[PDB]
Design a protein around this ligand. Structure first.
Ligand SMILES: CCCCCCCCCCCCCCCCC[C@@H](O)O[C@H](CO[C@H](O)CCCCCCCCCCCCCCC)COP(=O)(O)OCC[N+](C)(C)C
Ligand SMILES: CCCCCCCC/C=C\CCCCCCCC(=O)O[C@H](COC(=O)CCCCCCC/C=C/CCCCCCCC)COP(=O)(O)OCCN
Lengths: 83, 69
């Protein structure tokens, strides 16, 4: 409780560079696990169309697959524009 | 002496027969086992000498950015 406070005071007085390094590294380790925008980064990465979207053959049993890019079905990037 | 320390000839006779049967069966089993090992190692159609190949479940059967695989 008070021992760690004295140790931190001593380290800040003698080696501030190491204190800053440890604080920044600790924040870098811990903060991503508590951020709501990490999932947004994953979704943005998955939204980048590097290769061609190969069409699927219609078998008459695909209600959720669009027949045209402008059809309402399929994924939507509305969330990305407002971001 | 014969009554106290020994048995009749039938016991040794038939024990010899049983021993001979076991030994002859083991000999034929050994010869057959060698022949089976030779055939399996030559042809590879048996459970033995089954050397690994590549598992086919590692192949990715998805479109590959290019129509020609
Ligand atoms: C009338 C005067 C003349 C008679 C002379 C007779 C000659 C015989 C005397 C010599 C002794 C023979 C030597 C012992 C070798 C026999 C070993 C073996 O074959 O016997 C076994 C049997 O065991 C016997 O008990 C042998 C015991 C002999 C031990 C000898 C010890 C003598 C030492 C003397 C010590 C005296 C005191 C010491 C003071 C310090 C057999 O096993 P088992 O599979 O069942 O029998 C199968 C037959 N059945 C099925 C019919 C039963
Ligand atoms: C959890 C995340 C961790 C990852 C982040 C870190 C990234 C990289 C940072 C570390 C790099 C290597 C560190 C090397 C350690 C040096 C050890 C050492 O030898 O220390 C002594 C000095 O002693 C010290 O180590 C200084 C104090 C103890 C270490 C520094 C503080 C440790 C952590 C403090 C900060 C904690 C977090 C901040 C809290 C803020 C308040 C809430 C060196 O001095 P000398 O050269 O021997 O002296 C001769 C000349 N006088």
């Amino acid at each position: 409780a008070g021992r760690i406070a004295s140790f931190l005071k001593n380290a800040w007085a003698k080696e501030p560079v190491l204190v800053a390094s440890f604080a920044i590294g600790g924040l870098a380790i811990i903060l991503p696990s508590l951020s709501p925008y990490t999932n947004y980064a994953i979704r943005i990465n998955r939204a980048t169309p590097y290769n061609y979207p190969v069409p699927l053959r219609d078998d008459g049993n695909m209600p959720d697959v669009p027949s045209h890019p402008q059809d309402p079905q399929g994924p939507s990037l509305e969330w990305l524009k407002n971001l | 002496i014969a009554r106290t320390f020994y048995d009749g000839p039938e016991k040794n006779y038939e024990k010899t027969m049983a021993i001979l049967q076991i030994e002859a069966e083991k000999a034929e089993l050994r010869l057959k086992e060698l022949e089976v090992r030779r055939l399996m190692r030559a042809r590879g159609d048996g459970p033995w000498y089954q050397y690994p190949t590549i598992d086919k479940a590692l192949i990715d059967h998805s479109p590959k950015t290019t129509p020609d695989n």
